[PDB]
């Protein structure tokens, strides 16, 4: 779809294309079915593969727009509660790994670097969202969901939380009676010191 680009009066839009059909979904029929093999048969490299659609990118639109902006959240979503509940338990660890899909929070792969992508789609620490990136600022209109949705790295607060949850979990198991009463709390150390 296209705006009237020859328009006389000045508008916030000057000219705007739409990729209406959002047929990127068809490539996703393919690759998503391929990932049906397994998780991690899902990849940020598939995220990178947005180039292989129309020679383009994955600034998604329509419900796929939503799924895209939700994309990491989609995956993270129960990890969120794997924290809420299961950081009191264990697979918080896995949730960490899943954040590590979204990002590299962990203390690792300094040398591997472009191992995780010769194109620097990722960054040493992918501080923005793996699909996403920073943008021009804007003037406010702001029901809370707007914030909950805002196109900004603030979301890293998540990682911060996750991390504190990790150490907090460790702290509680150390709240358990155990003569090795400092010991593995060293990880509480490592964590805290990571900030």
């Amino acid at each position: 779809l296209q705006f009237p680009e020859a328009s006389s009066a000045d508008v916030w839009y000057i000219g705007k294309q739409i990729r209406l059909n959002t047929l990127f979904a068809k490539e996703l029929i393919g690759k998503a079915s391929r990932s049906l093999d397994l998780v991690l048969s899902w990849e940020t490299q598939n995220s990178r593969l947005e180039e292989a659609i129309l020679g383009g990118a994955a600034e998604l639109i329509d419900l796929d727009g939503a799924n895209g902006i939700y994309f990491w959240e989609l995956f993270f979503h129960m990890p969120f509660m794997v924290s809420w509940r299961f950081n009191v338990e264990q697979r918080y660890e896995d949730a960490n790994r899943w954040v590590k899909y979204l990002f590299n929070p962990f203390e690792c792969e300094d040398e591997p670097a472009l191992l995780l992508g010769k194109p620097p789609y990722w960054n040493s620490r992918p501080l923005v969202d793996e699909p996403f990136k920073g943008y021009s600022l804007t003037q406010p209109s702001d029901p809370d969901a707007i914030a909950a949705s805002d196109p900004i790295h603030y979301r890293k607060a998540v990682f911060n939380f996750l991390t504190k949850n990790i150490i907090d979990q460790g702290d509680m198991e150390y709240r358990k009676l155990q003569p090795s009463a400092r010991t593995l709390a060293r990880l509480s150390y490592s964590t805290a010191s990571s900030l």
């Binding site: 203390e107 300094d110 620490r125 790295h153 990571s194 900030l195």
Partner: peptide
């Protein structure tokens, strides 16, 4: 150095305080 050196880049917002509108809620004006 140490392998995979730690780097919590607290990216520089140069964090500075922000006004509550509840204080001076009259801004509702």
């Amino acid at each position: 150095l140490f392998p995979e050196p730690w780097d919590n880049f607290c990216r520089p917002g140069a964090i500075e305080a922000l006004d509550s509108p509840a204080s001076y809620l009259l801004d509702l004006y």
